[PDB]
Amino acid sequence: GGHPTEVLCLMNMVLPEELLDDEEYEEIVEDVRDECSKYGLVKSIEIPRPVDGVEVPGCGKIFVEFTSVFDCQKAMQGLTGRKFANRVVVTKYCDPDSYHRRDFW
Amino acid sequence: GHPTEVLCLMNMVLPEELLDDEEYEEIVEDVRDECSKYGLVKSIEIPRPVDGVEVPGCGKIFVEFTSVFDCQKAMQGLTGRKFANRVVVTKYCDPDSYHRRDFW
Amino acid sequence: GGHPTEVLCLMNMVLPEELLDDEEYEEIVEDVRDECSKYGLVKSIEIPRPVDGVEVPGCGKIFVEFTSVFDCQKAMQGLTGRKFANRVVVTKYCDPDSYHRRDFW
Amino acid sequence: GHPTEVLCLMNMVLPEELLDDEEYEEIVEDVRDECSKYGLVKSIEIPRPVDGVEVPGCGKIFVEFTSVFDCQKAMQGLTGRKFANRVVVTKYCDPDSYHRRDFW
Ligand SMILES: [Cl-]
Ligand SMILES: [Cl-]
Ligand SMILES: [Cl-]
Ligand SMILES: [Cl-]
Ligand code: NA
Ligand code: NA
């Protein structure tokens, strides 16, 4: 949500429909990791994609776990309002416990 | 309630999502397809909104399976946090009531 | 979100616009408390309303803190899909720490 | 950057929210009113989307105050989690650039 954490949530960048293709999916994950790594070490990344037809929790969102709240906030500073795939990047934080239990919503 | 062959799904659709014919048809298909993972779907009812006319059960999805066993599997599989942006809540429905459209 | 907690979130029931009037606001709070109290002790309730023109976090949502996750889940069982003010009640949970810091989103 | 009389607000509006004329006008008013809590608003720019034509700064809100002091108050007041469903991120903008519409 709005309370700062070490997990960045990047919104508005992808639709469920575009994560179906494995090659395109892997490219998006790498692009995200590379871009975020500019702001600090990325511990982990989650980009939920459809599984067996199901729009799973967090589909359409990208979650990036940093090793500090500062690095997450620097990535928010740097990435918010940029454009990717002709869409404006929207940012918020993710509760770490919610991230680890994949309650992405 | 004891298990039956009819399952009611709540928090799965809002009325406003069922106004457009194409969107409604797409939802029926998607729900049928999801339920068919658990067993043969015999029928489905998703009551559609009509402004200013009472539509019992609008906001709910009722699915009829060919067996109580399959319906039990579907209650386990569909209830909870497996879908985006919702917590699915379920209940078994009396099949005779379902066929009469006595939806609560 | 989807992980069960002691805080129930009731959605789709009110718009920010209808919480402006103090009398109507107080009636909604009481109606909620009375209805939820059927399922267990209500420790606290939050119904964010506009403050000095600002659609504050959680406006349009109603948050009810119970003393157990069971009581919250019983209220979810009983209230989900009911109608209030001609609107279908939609339910989810709220992270307790998010509730206490008013990160209602 | 050092403080200036122009503030850029991010995560406050999406392009799709600015397509309708009435909705756009309502957003401009609401943003003006919110900013006016901190000082006199001299001007505001909310670049509007045009499909297939590049619109620099679309997705951002730029507000010009009559003083750097008021703008500093507005950065403190508007940045963070005070508004529903968003985390407002801000930055100071070069006033000359703002007047030229050199929006980044
Ligand atoms: Cl966009
Ligand atoms: Cl209608
Ligand atoms: Cl409704
Ligand atoms: Cl256009
Ligand atoms: Na109706
Ligand atoms: Na454009």
Using the alpha-carbon principal axes, give the shape of chain A: globular
Spell out the CATH superfamily of chain A: RRM (RNA recognition motif) domain
Describe the sheet with the most strands of chain A: 4 strands, antiparallel
The first-to-last residue Cα distance of chain A is 11 Å
Query: What is the number of helical segments of chain A per DSSP (H or I, 4+ residues)?
Result: 3
Largest interface chains and counts: A-D, 14 and 12 residues
Task: Return the CATH architecture of chain A.
Answer: 2-Layer Sandwich
Radius of gyration of chain A: 13 Å
Kindly give the count of domains of chain A. 1
Assembly status: homotetramer
Question: Helix fraction of chain A?
Answer: 25-40%
Heterogens = chloride ion, sodium ion
Reading side by side through the largest sheet of chain A, how are the strands ordered? 2-3-1-6
Count of β-strands of chain A: 6
Order of helices and strands of chain A: EHEEHEEEH
Strand content of chain A: 15-25%
Please report the first level of CATH classification, the CATH class of chain A.
Alpha Beta
The third-level CATH topology of chain A is: Alpha-Beta Plaits
SSE-based structural type of chain A: alpha+beta
PDB class: rna binding protein
Keywords: Canonical RNA binding protein, RNA Splicing, Structural Genomics, PSI-biology, Partnership for T-Cell Biology, tcell
Assembly: tetrameric
Entry title: Crystal structure of a RNA binding domain of a U2 small nuclear ribonucleoprotein auxiliary factor 2 (U2AF) from Mus musculus at 1.80 A resolution
